């Protein structure tokens, strides 16, 4: 009885994408973040569900329930911090997943790449909504400034701002809605991620070389499962290092005081994975321009596949574009650094220059880089 | 089994059959987890001698 013809008329045929799937042999470590992202989803949902068994969305007993989780629940302190630092590991993994596609031209998978942007938008919505759950003077006020940006939309701004708020300002009505919304969205991400793979397995994967790897495909099961397991441990080591040795290293200290609408924090700022977008919005004094630039910078990913110019796919053999890619990464770090700083005269000048360079590089310099090399290679 | 090297006796005796391969994993986890805690705690309390509640308890509970 054919061992190869396994229990096929079942769900294993779908699981052949995990065992017998052809994969390029020259896959580097930067591809491991695909499997890490799935582990980040599962870890966030696992810790999230157990957090939701003691968290109460009412304003009068939201912050006090978070304290009860750490102080009273057995081993409840670690779960709160693997959730708080798992989001940090999520966006660490999320940004390298995007960066690898930029460098290795994976955006040529138009279906998968477009679903990837949708996946990115969903997580940043979930992360923003979950930050408001602790209700700790960074949750209330971080949500206050960002949500009020929608009031700049003409003729419908205040109509939907209140419809988001469930009232005239952020309050208990908004808090209960966010917790329910924060519960449902991660399960949507699982469905989209399955669709994300469905648009990729049909066209295979990519390689650092950028050429077709159909001549050197290898089975996934004995080579990449053990490669992803090692990559998973490096994620668990990195996440657990924060949780057990510096749990509040990334989170702002001001979040530990209960939310007070009458008092403002000394400095207002979102989490570290949104600080790069905060700087772009703060660059333009105009209100309508700032919200558009905030959305355009995130939504510029969908415009990247339409800007390809070089006859080579990956940046492996494109030294001119390599110099620009790390300039963009450095500039993205400059935006992150300046996002957490107050708006004064040194950061006003640097903030505008970094933001204007962020769009200039991708829109102008990178497409011009591909054209220059195309001429330089007799084609 | 009949070789003068430890691992050869360690493989044929245990790891040759996958049924006994899992036995050494589960039994090995029993003895590892018990010794690791004592091993990894005794070192921890050495770094914190005279610090924790265990090391300052003796001057309380009257007759105990």
């Amino acid at each position: 009885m054919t061992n190869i013809r396994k229990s096929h008329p079942l769900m294993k045929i779908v699981n052949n994408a995990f065992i017998d799937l052809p994969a390029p042999s020259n896959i580097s470590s930067w591809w491991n973040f695909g499997s890490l992202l799935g582990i980040c989803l599962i870890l966030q949902i696992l810790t999230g569900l157990f957090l939701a068994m003691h968290y109460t969305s009412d304003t009068t007993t939201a912050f006090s329930s978070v304290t009860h989780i750490c102080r009273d629940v057995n081993y409840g302190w670690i779960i709160r911090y693997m959730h708080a630092n798992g989001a940090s590991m999520f966006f660490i993994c999320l940004y390298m997943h995007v960066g690898r596609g930029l460098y290795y031209g994976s955006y040529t998978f138009l279906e998968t790449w477009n679903i990837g942007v949708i996946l990115l938008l969903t997580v940043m919505a979930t992360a923003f909504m979950g930050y408001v759950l602790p209700w700790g003077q960074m949750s209330f006020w971080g949500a206050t400034v960002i949500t009020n940006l929608l009031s700049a939309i003409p003729y419908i701004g205040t109509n939907l701002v209140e419809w988001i708020w469930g009232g005239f300002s952020v309050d208990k009505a908004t808090l209960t809605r966010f917790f329910a919304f924060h519960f449902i969205l991660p399960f949507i991400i699982m469905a989209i991620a399955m669709v994300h793979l469905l648009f990729l397995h049909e066209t295979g994967s990519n390689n650092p070389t950028g050429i077709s790897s159909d001549v050197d495909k290898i089975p996934f099961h004995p080579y990449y499962t053990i490669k992803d397991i090692l990559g998973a441990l490096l994620l668990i080591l990195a996440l657990m290092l924060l949780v057990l040795f510096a749990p509040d290293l990334l989170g702002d200290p001001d979040n530990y005081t209960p939310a007070n609408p009458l008092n403002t924090p000394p400095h207002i700022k979102p989490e570290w994975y949104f600080l790069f977008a905060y700087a772009i919005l703060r660059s333009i004094p105009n209100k309508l321009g700032g919200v558009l630039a905030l959305a355009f910078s995130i939504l510029i990913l969908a415009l990247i596949p339409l800007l390809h110019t070089s006859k080579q796919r990956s940046m492996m053999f494109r030294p001119l574009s390599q110099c620009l890619f790390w300039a963009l990464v450095a500039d993205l770090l400059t935006l992150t650094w300046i996002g957490g700083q107050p708006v004064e005269h040194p950061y006003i000048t640097i903030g505008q220059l970094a933001s204007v360079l962020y769009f200039l590089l991708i829109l102008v310099l990178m497409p011009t880089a591909g054209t220059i090399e195309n001429k330089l290679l007799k084609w | 089994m009949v070789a003068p090297t430890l691992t050869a006796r360690l493989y044929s005796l245990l790891f040759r059959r996958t049924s006994t391969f899992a036995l050494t994993i589960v039994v090995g986890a029993l003895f590892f987890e018990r010794a690791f805690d004592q091993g990894a705690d005794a070192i921890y309390e050495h770094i914190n001698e005279g610090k924790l509640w265990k090391h300052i308890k003796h001057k309380y509970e009257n007759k105990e």
């Binding site: 042999s25 006090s64 304290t67 750490c70 102080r71 302190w77 670690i78 290898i218 004995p222 080579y223 053990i226 490669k227 397991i229 090692l230 441990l233 490096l234 080591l237 657990m240 057990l244 040795f245 749990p247 509040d248 200290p253 001001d254 979040n255 530990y256 005081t257 000394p266 | 690791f36 805690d37 091993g39 990894a40 705690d41 070192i43 921890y44 770094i47 914190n48 005279g50 610090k51 924790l52 509640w53 300052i56 308890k57 309380y60 509970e61």
Partner: protein, 241 residues
């Protein structure tokens, strides 16, 4: 623009990656709270039962709890009545509402001390420097009544009178109760009141390091062993003629 003074990095008994809290200092740190802080500062997230196994025994903590009367439990007649506290009771609140607190002081509202270590930039280093950093105001300032000059406080004008001085209290074990010594114990206590998981945080951290330190070389070996087939793989191209 009201320049801020950076708190110094005071070495602590719990500053290392694996160093734990000095529970002897915690017990002395609570004595500062029950005598000085609790007069006009609240701690509404730490119970009298939390001190069991940390700085006081079960019998010691029961005596501490029963020392203070608490109001709870509707009488069968339908009225509130006083009773000695129990282990499960939280630390007494000096005032019922923040409005009363602003009335007791010069409008300033004493912040809750449960998370004040983790809710301020600098942690215990800033708090220790704030308690001991009180100094005579420099020439050219004008401080309103009920306001005192503390450089470590943002704005350099704090509404809190100096709460710590030499022999402000007396310690059970008899260490010299000085301005610096008393501030250190309460700072050690205020950290435990903020991160009770501090000891277990490092205790599991040591085990993870001793676990990842062994599994990572081992897991790497499995990766290399399975991939050693492709790493040692020779290709030969032999086209016909």
């Amino acid at each position: 623009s009201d320049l801020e003074l950076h708190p110094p990095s005071y070495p602590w008994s719990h500053r290392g990656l694996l160093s734990s809290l000095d529970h002897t200092s915690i017990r002395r740190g609570f004595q500062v709270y029950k005598q000085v802080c609790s007069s006009c500062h609240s701690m509404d997230y730490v119970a009298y039962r939390h001190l069991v196994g940390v700085c006081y025994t079960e019998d010691e903590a029961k005596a501490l709890a029963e020392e203070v009367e608490v109001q709870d439990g509707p009488n069968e007649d339908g009225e509130m009545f006083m009773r000695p506290g129990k282990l499960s009771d939280y630390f007494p609140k000096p005032y019922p509402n923040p409005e009363a607190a602003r009335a007791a002081n010069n409008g300033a509202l004493p912040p809750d001390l449960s998370y004040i270590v983790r809710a301020r930039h600098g942690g215990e280093d800033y708090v220790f420097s704030l308690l001991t950093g009180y100094c005579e105001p420099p020439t050219g300032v004008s401080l309103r009544e009920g306001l005192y000059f503390n450089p470590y406080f943002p704005g350099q004008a704090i509404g809190m009178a100096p709460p710590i001085y030499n022999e402000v209290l007396e310690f059970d074990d008899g260490t010299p109760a000085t301005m610096s010594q008393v501030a250190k114990d309460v700072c050690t206590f205020l950290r435990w009141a903020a991160e009770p998981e501090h000891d277990h945080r490092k205790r599991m951290g040591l085990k993870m390091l001793l676990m990842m330190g062994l599994l990572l070389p081992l897991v790497y070996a499995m990766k290399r062993h399975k991939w050693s087939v492709l790493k040692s793989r020779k290709l030969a191209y032999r086209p016909p003629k």
